Amino acid sequence: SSQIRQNYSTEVEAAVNRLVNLYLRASYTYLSLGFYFDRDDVALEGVCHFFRELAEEKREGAERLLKMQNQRGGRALFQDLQKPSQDEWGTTLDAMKAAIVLEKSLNQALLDLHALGSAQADPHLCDFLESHFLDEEVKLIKKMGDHLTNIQRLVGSQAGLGEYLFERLTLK
Amino acid sequence: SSQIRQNYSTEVEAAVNRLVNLYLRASYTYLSLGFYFDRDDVALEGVCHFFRELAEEKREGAERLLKMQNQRGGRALFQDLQKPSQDEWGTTLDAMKAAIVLEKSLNQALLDLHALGSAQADPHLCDFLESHFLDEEVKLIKKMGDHLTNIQRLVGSQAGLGEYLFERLTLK
Amino acid sequence: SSQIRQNYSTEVEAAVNRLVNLYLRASYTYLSLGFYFDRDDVALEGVCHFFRELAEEKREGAERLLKMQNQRGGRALFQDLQKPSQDEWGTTLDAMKAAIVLEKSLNQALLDLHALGSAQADPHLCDFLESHFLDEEVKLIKKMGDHLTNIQRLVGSQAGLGEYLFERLTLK
Ligand SMILES: [Au+]
Ligand SMILES: [Au+]
Ligand SMILES: [Au+]
Ligand SMILES: [Cl-]
Ligand SMILES: [Cl-]
Ligand SMILES: [Cl-]
Ligand SMILES: [Cl-]
Ligand SMILES: [Cl-]
Ligand SMILES: [Cl-]
Ligand SMILES: [Cl-]
Ligand SMILES: [Cl-]
Ligand SMILES: [Cl-]
């Protein structure tokens, strides 16, 4: 094992590699969502921007996990990335529903890794997650929930109108 | 339950609402302490200012708890606020003793909520308390203990003299 | 006990005093390492500077522990400081190996104190260590491990050459 490794279980090391794969899969999903909203037959620029910014945040989360794996003396191991679950993402409402389902799965994976760290008595790992991940996911999920309420109140009987207005007046 | 709620127990949700009530009660107590020291027959401006600033800090603590309740998908519920325990607060020594008793009760309520979060495996809640509340209460209680030692060493056999000097030279 | 003390076990108080002694011993060891590399017959200025800066960081860690002991209402108690384990420290490789052994002992003492805090349900203590100590030790141990790999790849069959180059091009 590493010259530096101390109090770092093989179970946590493997779970960190699987979480890197989830975050990179989530980034890839957001890349697909963003380019879908840039299609000329979809054409919602603020929705495109919202998802492209999330693609960058999820890749940054993966790279912070990989930095920490090396700082603890674990060994990064990469696996195939599965393509996103859809090729076309429907309305902004459909896309925001898929986004909050994706973020709740990331949050559950973070909470499961925290529970493993707590069982392994690994307080650096618990610190790391509580400082860089758990509050970021709660805030993002709250933000998506607010958006989903506003998109839903705009459907009325003029769904196209509501979709334009949300993009223009909430997402710029 | 919320579209956003995840890993957030009904027990924690209720305990957060009760802690909001404690913090708003503490704010109300500090408002009363501050206006008492502004009476013309008490007239200790630095003591007034010390307690009025604490009234604001305790209201800010309540509003940060309420923000977090909504970020987790819980439901704020407000109850009646009881009036403070006294209408007149005696000397600066009496008032500082009542203040440290009040802050030790807030600290115990924070530690009890942390213990509930730890039993519910709610690391976002534990993070939140450890980042925004626990060190603020330890520092404030230390600061009050320092003040109580200085007020006590000033009583001597010239209590009025000591009360003036403490207000002038420690609390500006 | 203190007017301020709350949820602060005698076991944690004593363990904090022992950790202060370890940190001051580590500072003293780094003072010795730094002055050894300033000898005219050793003369590695970047190595001197590296260890003198660690002597200051370990003394600062002791003083932050002592500040927290007083903020919790415990009582600082100082013991004799043992001299460092060596009077002469060999090559930069020998010195960096002794440094990472010393930092791994500090890290284990921090993890043991965190485990005691967790058993005593002392979340302020756990917070304190996770915020000011645990990530600083992981980062430093990683940094020393990187240095040890670079020093080792420079030994070749020209050890003096490698020792000069490391000092000049990594440690300025
Ligand atoms: Au942990
Ligand atoms: Au927890
Ligand atoms: Au703890
Ligand atoms: Cl544009
Ligand atoms: Cl697939
Ligand atoms: Cl407008
Ligand atoms: Cl004035
Ligand atoms: Cl009442
Ligand atoms: Cl003066
Ligand atoms: Cl020089
Ligand atoms: Cl000795
Ligand atoms: Cl050069």
Do residues A20 and A66 touch, judged by C-beta distance below 8 A? Answer: yes
Closest by alpha carbon to A133, among A145, A146, A121, A117?
A117
Which superfamily, per CATH, for A1-172? Ferritin, core subunit, four-helix bundle (1.20.1260.10)
Cα separation, B53 vs C8, whole angstroms? 28
- The C-alpha atoms of residue A165 and residue A171 are separated, in whole angstroms, by 9
CA gap A108, A115 in Å, rounded: 10
CB pairs < 8 Å spanning A and C: 45
C38 phi and psi angles, rounded to 5 deg:
-90, -5
Q: Are A137 and A105 in contact (CB under 8 A)?
A: no
Residues 6 or more apart whose Cβ sits within 8 Å of residue C169:
none
The residue type at C95: A
Q: Check CB contact under 8 Å for B130 and C123.
A: yes
Joined tokens for residue A10: 């093989």
Cα–Cα distance for residue pair B63/C7, rounded to 1 Å: 26
Interface of A with C (CB under 8 A): 2-4, 6-7, 70-73, 121, 123-124, 126-128, 130
- What experiment produced this structure? X-ray
Please give the residue of chain B at the shortest CA–CA distance from C128.
Answer: B135
Please report where in the chains the tokens 């758990």 appear, as a residue. Answer: A134
For chain C, the farthest-separated pair of C-alpha atoms sits apart, in whole angstroms, at: 65
Full DSSP string of A31-96? HHHHHHHTSTTT--HHHHHHHHHHHHHHHHHHHHHHHHHHHHT------PPPPPS-S---SHHHHH
| Radius of gyration of the CA atoms of chain A, in A | 18
Distance from CA of A108 to the nearest CA of B (A): 8
A103 carries a ligand binding annotation:
no
Closest in B104, B115, B138 to C72, CB measured: B138
- Which other chains touch chain A, taking contact as 3+ CB pairs less than 8 Å apart? B, C
B122 in Cβ contact with B8 (< 8 Å):
yes
Residues with CB under 5 A from ligand 11 (ion): C 82
Q: Taking the domains of chain B in order of start, what are their residue ranges?
A: 1-172
Q: What is the whole-number distance in angstroms between the Cα of residue C165 and the centre of ligand 10?
A: 16
Q: Which of A120, A127, A131 to mutate to test the interface with C (most CBs of C within 10 A)?
A: A127
CB within 8 A of A133, min separation 6: which ones? A61, A110
For the record, the structure tokens of A114 come out as 């925290």
Q: Find out whether B152 and A163 touch, Cβ atoms under 8 Å.
A: no
Q: Is residue C98 a contact partner of residue C85, using CB atoms and an 8 Å limit?
A: yes
Resolution limit, Å: 1.2
- Long-range CB pairs of A163-166 (<8 Å, 24+ gap) are A163/A44, A163/A91, A163/A92, A163/A93, A166/A92
Of C3, C70, C123, Cβ closest to residue B134: C123
Q: Are A98 and A89 in contact (CB under 8 A)?
A: yes
Question: How far lies B29's CA from each of B59, C91, C156, in Å?
Answer: 11, 65, 73
Contact C148 A72 (CB under 8 A): no
Quick one: how far is CA A45 from the chain centroid?
Answer: 20
Distance, CA of A18 to CA of A23 (rounded, Å): 9
